[PDB]
Write an enzyme that holds these catalytic residues in place. Structure first.
Site, short mmCIF file in Angstrom:
data_model
loop_
_atom_site.label_atom_id
_atom_site.label_comp_id
_atom_site.label_asym_id
_atom_site.label_seq_id
_atom_site.Cartn_x
_atom_site.Cartn_y
_atom_site.Cartn_z
CG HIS B 88 28.14 7.17 -103.12
ND1 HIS B 88 27.96 8.54 -103.32
CD2 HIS B 88 28.39 6.65 -102.03
CE1 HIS B 88 28.30 8.87 -102.19
NE2 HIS B 88 28.60 8.23 -101.43
CB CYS B 130 26.73 11.05 -108.18
SG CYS B 130 26.78 10.36 -106.47
#
Lengths: 234, 237
Positions: B88, B130
Site C-alpha cells: 500500500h 497507491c
C-alpha cells in the site's frame, strides 16, 4: 505504432518563457546567462521545425495566460506541443517576475480532458530552474488516461541546486542544445535526454571561492508518461 | 560508449518486497492479488539472470534495515541492482505491515556516496502502490559523478493517484511489465520496455465496479530516469 505519428503539416508550437528580471519583492537575483540559453534553445527547436515563440519576464497569471491560451488553440495539424520554462525555482513551483506559480498549474491546461486537439500527442515540458537547497558533493469504443502522454525534463533532481555559469548559461542547456544540434533528428527523445544526463554529469563541475559552493555536481531528472517512441522526423 | 557495461560475473541482486498483510491499526486491508505479482516478477527477473530474493509482510524497520544491508554488501561483481516494492502507498510513502515509511529514505541507501560498489551502475526501483486518492476519469577530479546519478524509478501510477489491482489477476502494472519482459526482456532497452508498459496499461485496462465512483477508471504509470546510458539486460553485440 511504436512511434508517435509525425505525419502532420506542423511539428507543433514551442513556447519559451525566459524569466530573467524579478520584482524587488521576490528577493530574487538576476539570472545572467538565461538569454544565452534562450537563444540556443530558440535555434535548436527551430531546427527541429518547431514554431518557437519567446516571452520575457512574465509574471504568474501571464504564464497561466499563455499556457491557457495555447491549450485552447487548435493543434489538429500539429504533431506535438513543447513549452520551455527558464526561471528561479523551489520544490514543485516556479517563479514569475512577481511571485511563484506551481508547475502542475501550468501543465494541467493540457490534460487530455482539457485539450482535445493534443490528445494522444506528446506534450513536452523542459524546465531549467532551482529545486531547493541541496547541492551535490560527488564521488569518483475505448478511453485513454488524461495524464498520459506528458514528458518533463527537469534541469535537476527534486530538492537540488541548478547550475548556470553567467557567461555560458545552463549546464543543462549547453548540453541539450549541442545534443539536439548534432542528433536531434536521429535519436529517440529518451536517448537524447539520457545523453544530456550523461553529459551534464561527467563533464561539469562547479567552482567557487566559497568552499560551500566549490566542486559541486548536478544530474537532470526526466519524468516520462509517453506511450510511444518519439522521433522528431519521418 | 552509450550502453551500461554488462560484462560482470552476475547481472545483480533483485530484492522483491511483497506486502500482503497489514496490522489492523494501520486501517489497511489484505492486498489480494499481490502473490500473483511477486510470482510473475520473480520468474521474470530470475529469467533475466537476477539473483532474486522475495521477502514477505515486512515491517517498516525491516524494509529500512533490509535495504541498508543490501547497499552495504559488495556489488563489484554485479552489473546493476533492482528492487521491487509491492505494498500500500500514499504520496511519498510505502507501508510496512507496521505503518508507513518514506520511499526516498529507502532508496537513499544506494546513493553514490553511500554505496560505492554500485557507483556508475543502474539502480532500478519498481513500485506498485497507491500514490494518492485521485482517480483518472478518462477520455475517448578527474571528474567526480553526482550521488543521485544512475537511478530509475518506475511507479505504477502518477503522483497523487490510485493504483489498480485485481484480486484475481494482480495489478495492471505488473501484469503488463511481466508480460513484456517475457516477450522482449532481452531485446528492448529499459525505457522501451517501460514505454510499452505505459502503453499497455493506458490502452488496455479499465476499472469495472458497482460503486460508479470507482467505475470505468483509467491509469498511467510514471517513469523517472536519472540514467546516464542505455540499458539492456544482455552483453550480446
Amino acid at each position: 505504432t511504436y512511434q508517435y505519428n509525425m505525419n502532420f503539416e506542423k511539428l507543433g508550437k514551442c513556447i519559451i518563457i525566459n524569466n530573467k528580471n524579478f520584482d524587488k519583492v521576490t528577493g530574487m537575483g538576476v539570472r545572467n546567462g538565461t538569454d544565452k540559453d534562450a537563444e540556443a534553445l530558440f535555434k535548436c527547436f527551430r531546427s527541429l521545425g518547431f514554431d518557437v515563440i519567446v516571452y520575457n519576464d512574465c509574471s504568474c497569471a501571464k504564464m497561466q495566460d499563455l499556457l491557457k491560451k495555447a491549450s485552447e488553440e487548435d493543434h489538429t495539424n500539429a504533431a506535438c506541443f513543447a513549452c520551455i520554462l527558464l526561471s528561479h525555482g523551489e520544490e514543485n513551483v516556479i517563479y514569475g517576475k512577481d511571485g511563484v506559480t506551481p508547475i502542475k498549474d501550468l501543465t494541467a491546461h493540457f490534460r487530455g480532458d482539457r485539450c482535445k486537439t493534443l490528445l494522444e500527442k506528446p506534450k513536452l515540458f523542459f524546465i531549467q530552474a532551482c529545486r531547493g537547497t541541496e547541492l551535490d558533493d560527488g564521488i569518483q469504443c475505448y478511453k485513454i488516461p488524461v495524464e498520459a502522454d506528458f514528458l518533463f525534463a527537469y534541469s535537476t533532481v527534486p530538492g537540488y541546486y541548478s547550475w548556470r555559469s553567467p557567461g555560458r548559461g545552463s549546464w543543462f542547456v549547453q548540453a541539450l542544445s549541442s545534443i539536439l544540434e548534432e542528433h536531434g533528428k536521429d535519436l529517440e527523445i529518451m536517448q537524447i535526454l539520457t545523453r544530456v544526463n550523461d553529459r551534464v554529469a561527467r563533464h561539469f563541475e562547479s567552482q567557487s571561492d566559497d568552499p560551500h559552493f566549490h566542486e559541486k555536481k548536478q544530474i537532470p531528472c526526466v519524468v516520462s508518461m509517453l506511450t510511444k517512441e518519439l522521433y522528431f522526423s519521418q
